[PDB]
Symmetry: D2
Subunit: 491 residues, 4 copies
């Protein structure tokens, strides 16, 4: 082939520094979306396995070395882990690509690079986490201590396996927490590989526990656990409801939700059309639309709409959908599995039926679970395709007249994850940025953030931040301490 | 009477700057725990009234002046409100005290003073709320904007009505949010009075909406509302479950929970026994134990235990339970209502039945009547597994226990589902540091209790909740953090 | 017409009292509209500075002010802001008569910013924070942000009330005691403000005002062995003497707010009518007696000719006259005879070096120290008028071709206080803002800041920030506190 | 025994190369154990400083370093930290022979703190933040935290590696170019560190090392017209000259880390054996050649007699000798002949003024600059030995009655660098900590800080912080940016 197919080494659960089978001895299969065939038979975690992993994390936090280590010591190990992710980038990229149906070179440069980058950023945060010394109403000394919380429960999706693992694990490790990670059943391989690398880096046993299994089994047990201090969840808005219920029905642990989106990209009259078209293609079709922040709604101002529409249709004619391991041309790979592939085509079918015009794509291909990049035109705001998260290579292209109209239409969603603005006008950019109810707003770009940039939703896209110093908050216990002072010359 | 009984002026719902009746025309009574008699007939808000209030708050945020005003402008209006609370402190104190069964002088100095203080602290925060300018991975400029969130839903308890109103309203107002406040049905008068004073201060119509009603009606409607951006809740751990469910079943709005507690107070052998006893009395019995952070569990080291126990029983002999409006000597007033009175009496009876020793109180009292008066109760020979040791009584009940080691004191302090507050009484700096850092509580007082100020963040750990009330930390729940990224062309530095 | 105020405060303000100088000496303050004596002010020297420093030392070491809670200090500070607002008209008329200003402009701008600075720091007082640090082992570390002690303040004549408030407000909030040396040309506002502070409840000894001459009273304060810091605002040349005075005494930290030669850059992009109106205000506000005045105006070649013609036409309706008797008055007299002659000397020098006189360039007096607003065209960068701070109503109007040229020319100064950019282009705005070595950069506006905005120079314009939470730093002592921990379950 | 290192780097380090001085002049560095020449080091003067400043100017204005991302600068700094760790033994041996230190103490303390400071700031590089401000109307305001430019560094001979790192690390992270003037007595470590920084990937011109004499090389750097700031560490008397050099040149901000006369307070409740052992280390670490050394020890009257006796018996087992040949060696020789004679002069002066000699007070040498650790009893506060910085193994042991007396006596100094408190009482500890006017206060310990802990003087011990996120401020330009907003839905 073009890229070397990796050898599957880690298929068991990772509890207390060891690779172990499920209590039941049950396995679940992970498949290659390029072929639809079984890659590996992975240990199937259930309630009993989650209990064992939570017990291992509890012992690691309450009695283990990790919270008792200096921030410098924790950051030292976290950096060695970042070094290992970088050293084994190629292997990890192919392993994630084969499991998630993506391009190994894109996975290495984007996914693995961001994973290593997130680990490095928090390794540098570990020795500089600060609390405050407060201003008191009298002869008192007050301060806050920013303590490790305890046992962190992590539930993540299948679209960015390595990045999802790092973005949750990294701020939790720097905070001094012990972890229980439940990766998505569709792509469980990267999380098990990363667990082995953390062991090699010097992360103490019990600090990182990986429990691959099904959501209503393993995931629900973790979200409902009486000895888990917090839960950081990334997935659908509908499953987010169940995570909130699981906490309410258990120990009322704080819940942090990174949910779906229906991200709008607004293109103005003054934009360079060639850059705006190229930006829109990337924004909508990166990772075959299996991106939470994907620009599923593209808004183009009436004066340049016809030109944009023509240039977009022309650009899509040179776009290649195929096997990233055998085809060099390949711009897009297959969808994660059978269930997702049926779901996108059903939405394409819904789009056709409700009266939307098909500009490009709208049908399956195969040189596997391949769908061509779809662009819907003459889209009404009330349409299913306009409102619902498709999570596939589907773009809704719309026309607008005013700045006011662009703002109101961008905000006409239950969601509020990301948004984009393409304009040269400083006053238009400022107005649009400040008026769109989204957690992240890109101006004349898309996706670009870095680990210093906090990422989180607004409205039904969730709450809580991943990345930035902001990410640490969910993993820390803020403790206020008050004592009287005797004859202090100042207060 | 020693304190003037106030004139009840505000009994209707406060929606879009006006005092209006409920859509149903229904009322609910608020009673005086000193007599058991009706003070006023308050408008009963339901689903329809909460919608009206949320629509008023939505119009005020989306199209009104409040989020469009500068932090300085919001700050001046907030300081005028703080000035009004101070100017009308006596009337508000009398009103809250008659509704809650409090001492008017204590309420003025503590409750009203903290309410005015929280409004002032956030008035000063309004013109200095900052976001960041970020460090980017290349030729990019990144920044965060700390925007007003939108419509803030507030659900609060009956124990500190004025303080609860201010502690939620003040950071929200400073953040530039519009509010919908659901006060507890037992004490709804203060929230209504405060709403009128905000109108006088210059708070625009629709920014503060007060909807008194029942929890499963008006409270559930607010927590389940599809157009409410966040919910800040203060109340029991059991109702907290329903707030989280209401969000999950609606628009998944962020929820912030300020829940119950079973706060431990640890006294070591090196303590001054007279100060430690006097501190324990205040920590346990302030506001007749109707305090979330009340030291319901007192742990005294074995060498000084017998002396502490004797000094505590002696101190309680001079404690006065009675009418704060007619008796000057009164240290403690009646419990909020009949329901709370029976609930505390049931826990005392349960305590006796499980084998705990009654050191003092444990029975009803006090003046010629009439009134929900309970003697401050101290339980001795309490086992950790006992109901009285684990459950929140929310009455004048203290569980007195003995301990040997620092390690034992820590483990026993942590033997709770809760983690709101805790106290340490010691002269030893190393013991104080170890106990402070080992007790899983949101607030730890060393050689004092309650003292915080508005710069001090307050929030639970474990089943006592999450999220901070007070401090600059309080603003977070009312703000939307927006990350903004743009490329840079030929910047000489990054 | 505006009512001429009655002068009531002419003595030194030491330990809560209005006292005469030890010598019994006075110095005259004059009205630039007539050149006549307004009042005879007590002349402070070394002995009076000693008395004021001793009063501040007693107030800090033994007095109430540092022992009060931030909340208590905040209420007193806010009462002072309320008083400045209540007496705004009287203070504006007083400052206007003394400095040759328009009483309505002084009320809206100068007095409003003074009241605003006091309010901002009143709200800062109860929320000043230190940190709880991340330690290398079983240790607990924290920083305390303590009041420093005795703050020495030396300020100029151009913005008397604003200068007083901008130094006094963060010092007051920090819990410091003060010794203020106002400029001899305008000493009246400071003495009025001192009385207002006493009425607000500021304890005796906390605010001491010692008007006098720079080499006498000013040098004594800068050289004092018991002064903990010096905040200086004035010329770059006097700044040298403040640094020497500290070096020759107790090596107290020095904070310098020096001169400027601020550039305003206008692109082809700009609305010419708004750009001309902005330039007029930026160059001629307070008769060019502004440190941040746009003394250099750069206009891109394509719109230069139109800008130049519109500017000359705009200046034809500009009124220079008595602000107390003429309603149309846009500009008052220059502060005094010395400043008046210094500006005329620079105008004459400009003519002699070959620069074209577009408008003004000669005295008016409708007798008074009135100078016509001056615009110089065909200005070479090497010219005296192009490089030196004139501090009068003089604008140097220049032409440019490229963004690169505009940046290089803006930076061709020893100074770096302020700068301005007029453009609709977001990328041009970002590039110029980030490339111009100035403390403040205004985009499509000028002067606008507010008390949350830190103000300070770069290069020879100084160092240190006035305004913002940043202004508190110079008045605080950061104390690091370290103790071991015994068996802490986390670090 | 320990291995004597090879001397490899003896030339100036300018623009990535080891070059000779323009004059071709050299100065000798000597071994304090023998008094013999170790190496002949290139002697920098005005011309060499000019060359180094020009190299730093080109590196900042046109080079890669300020244009690289914080992440990029952080990886290079972490590679440098890794190299300092890899070559720790060689560097410790190099610094030890040059400064008269124990190679094992230099490795664990000096080299460990140097590597630790580089690592802390490598982790700071990708997370330096400015603010987005609260505006007085329809305006958007923000601050940018820019690299300042050319940083001038002047450091002492006592902690060569630590001094180099503590100045270079925040400056590097900030994106500055540097010119380092190390002390003439110990120039070797700085040249070795410069070579390691080249190996790590620090671009040419970013780190320039100019060993030379103070009034020549040092004065030229402090007076340079193209240097943006100066961070100085040394004596209080030389600090005066650094302030004068900036005042007489370009008025660049100056940051001073000066001398001290640090008090250690021991109360009646202390464990005498721990308090004696702590005092021994606090006074005699690095043969009293420590700025923060506890040169004044105050013991409460009830435990004074026991403390005094235990201290004299503890000193009987203390070994002064060659650390390279004697394993028992607790103390090495004084840096040079000049320092040796200066300490002996102070000991002789102490005897002359009436102070009692408890231990030491005479030379030892098993020849080569060895002085016995000296303890003076019956010391009056007015004595020379009580007030002046000896900078040798000399301790003044005094008795006190009250907490109030301990505070007033601790504060009876022109200095305010460090202080220590030994007590079990939480209220006494808090009162002493908050009442002693010192930048650092250790409670029941000494020296312990870590790189998160800011270090700086108060009073005549200076101003400005080394270490912590606080250390970055001096190397950054804070730029305020203001623009109007059109129809923003919120402000
Ligand atoms: N924010 C700022 O940066 C800012 C603001 C306003 C004005 N300014 C600057 O102020 C200058 C105009 O004011 P000025 O003419 O009053 O300046 P100046 O330098 O002559 O004097 C300023 C102050 O210093 C005193 N002074 C003079 N000689 C002294 C000495 N030897 N020792 C100690 N103090 C001494 C004066 O009495 C006065 O109080 C201009 O250069 C202008 O740019 C700067
Ligand atoms: Na798969
Ligand atoms: Na009631
Ligand atoms: Na005058
Ligand atoms: Na040497």
């Amino acid at each position: 082939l073009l890229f070397d197919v990796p050898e599957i080494r880690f298929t068991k659960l990772f509890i207390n520094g060891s690779f172990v089978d499920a209590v039941s001895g049950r396995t679940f299969d992970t498949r290659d979306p390029r072929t639809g065939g079984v890659i590996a038979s992975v240990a199937e975690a259930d309630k009993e396995d989650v209990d064992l992993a939570v017990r291992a994390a509890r012992a690691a936090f309450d009695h283990g070395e990790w919270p008792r280590m200096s921030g410098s010591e924790r950051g030292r190990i976290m950096a060695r882990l970042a070094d290992l992710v970088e050293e084994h980038a190629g292997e990890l990229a192919a392993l994630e690509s084969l499991d998630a149906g993506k391009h190994p070179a894109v996975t290495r440069a984007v996914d693995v690079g961001n994973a290593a980058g997130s680990l490095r950023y928090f390794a540098g945060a570990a020795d500089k986490i600060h609390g405050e010394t407060l201003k008191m109403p009298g002869q008192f000394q007050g301060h806050t201590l920013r303590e490790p919380l305890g046992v962190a429960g992590v539930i993540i999706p299948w679209n960015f396996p390595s990045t999802m693992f790092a973005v949750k694990v990294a701020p939790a490790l720097a905070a001094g927490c012990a972890l229980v990670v439940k990766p998505a059943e569709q792509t469980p391989l990267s999380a098990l590989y990363l667990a082995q690398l953390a062991k090699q880096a010097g992360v103490p046993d019990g600090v990182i526990n990986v429990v691959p299994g099904f959501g209503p089994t393993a995931g629900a047990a973790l979200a409902s656990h009486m000895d888990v201090d917090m839960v950081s969840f990334t997935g659908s808005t509908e499953v987010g409801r169940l995570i909130m219920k699981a906490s309410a029905e258990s120990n009322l642990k704080p819940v942090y939700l990174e949910l779906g989106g229906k991200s709008p990209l607004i293109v103005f009259d003054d934009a360079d059309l060639d850059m705006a078209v190229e930006l829109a293609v990337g924004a909508s079709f990166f990772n075959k639309g299996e991106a939470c922040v994907a620009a599923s709604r593209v808004y183009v101002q009436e004066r340049v709409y016809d030109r944009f529409e023509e240039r977009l249709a022309e650009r899509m004619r040179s776009w290649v959908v195929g096997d990233p391991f055998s085809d060099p041309r390949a711009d897009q790979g297959p969808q994660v599995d059978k269930a997702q592939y049926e779901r996108v085509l059903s939405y394409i079918d819904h789009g056709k039926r409700e009266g939307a015009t098909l500009l490009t794509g709208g049908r399956p291909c195969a040189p596997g679970y391949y769908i061509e990049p779809t662009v819907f035109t003459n889209v009404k705001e009330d349409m299913i395709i306009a409102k619902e998260e498709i999570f596939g290579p589907v773009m809704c292209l719309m026309k607008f007249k005013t700045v006011e109209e662009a703002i109101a239409r961008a905000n006409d969603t239950r969601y509020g994850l990301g948004a984009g603005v393409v304009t040269r006008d400083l006053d238009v950019a400022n107005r649009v940025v400040r008026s769109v109810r989204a957690g992240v707003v890109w101006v004349n770009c898309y996706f670009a953030m870095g680990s210093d940039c906090p990422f989180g939703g607004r409205k039904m896209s969730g709450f809580g931040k991943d990345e930035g110093m902001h990410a640490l908050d969910k993993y820390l216990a803020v403790k206020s301490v008050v004592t009287p002072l005797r004859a202090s010359p100042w207060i």
